[PDB]
């Protein structure tokens, strides 16, 4: 607890640094690079509808 309580050593001349972590759910987008294990690399040309 004391290790958390003591102010962490910081780069000189900085009073405080706040590390904000941003988390995003990136999905399949046209142009995303998808490849198989055999090396057939390709981009996603179009998000085709299921019925098509």
């Amino acid at each position: 607890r004391r290790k958390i309580t003591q102010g962490d050593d910081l780069a000189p001349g900085v009073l405080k640094i706040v590390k904000v972590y941003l988390a995003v759910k990136r999905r399949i987008q046209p142009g995303d690079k998808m490849a198989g294990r055999h090396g057939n690399k390709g981009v996603i040309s179009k998000i085709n509808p299921i019925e098509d």
Partner: protein, 221 residues
């Protein structure tokens, strides 16, 4: 000219049923099968969760004590949840189960308008007797696929992508009809692999309507 009928609607299983359209002429049957399959796969009314508020977690990318799966895992399980509602468009369902044992759709509080097609479906696993889970899942009807980002308040409410499509796999088979009075007639048998929320005959009739009103545009005023 002849007009088809749903002479037979057999429920071979709860998930998927086969629908037969016997009085179909040559060529008409294949066209109707393809058009019905496309219109069913594309746009059918359906019920799926769209917002979940776990009481104890702030964001989806976090864990809750006593729950084996992640909160995001809970949302992924809840996304493919078999729900039918009749009456009001949107309904909030409350889940509160305590103690050991995996929670199921049956654990959700039962309301009059909404009945779960698949109670045996598993949401998450409660691995602590002391721990408990409370949530409010909001289910509304929609069409096609709606990403979570496209939709839209407090930090507690979690947005989950909505997949309103009740039909998962659809195939139509065109074979010669058994009528003897007039040959070359071919019956159409359509099998719809569905989540179970949609009625087969009702889904076929609704798709036929949607095609008709979309087709009514072509004829002149």
């Amino acid at each position: 000219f002849l007009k088809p009928r749903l002479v037979d609607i057999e429920q071979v299983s709860s998930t998927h049923a086969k629908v037969t359209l016997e009085p179909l002429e040559r060529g008409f049957g294949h066209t109707l099968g393809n058009a019905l399959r496309r219109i069913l796969l594309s746009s059918m009314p359906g019920c799926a969760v769209t917002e979940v508020e776990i009481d104890g977690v702030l964001h989806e990318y976090s864990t809750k004590e006593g729950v084996q799966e992640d909160i995001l895992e809970i949302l992924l399980n809840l996304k493919g949840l078999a729900v039918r509602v009749q009456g009001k468009d949107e309904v909030i369902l409350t889940l509160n189960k305590s103690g050991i044992g995996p929670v199921t759709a049956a654990d959700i509080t039962h309301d009059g308008d909404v009945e779960i097609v698949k109670p045996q479906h598993v949401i998450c696993h409660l691995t602590d007797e002391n721990a408990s889970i409370s949530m409010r899942i909001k289910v509304q009807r929609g069409r096609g696929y709606v990403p979570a980002s496209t939709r839209i308040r407090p930090i507690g409410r979690l947005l989950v992508d909505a997949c309103y499509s009740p039909v998962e796999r659809i195939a139509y088979n065109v074979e010669a009809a058994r009528v003897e009075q007039r040959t070359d007639l071919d019956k159409l048998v359509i099998e719809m692999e569905t989540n179970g929320t949609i009625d087969p005959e009702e889904a076929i009739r609704r798709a036929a309507t949607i095609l008709a009103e979309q087709l009514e545009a072509f004829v002149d005023l």
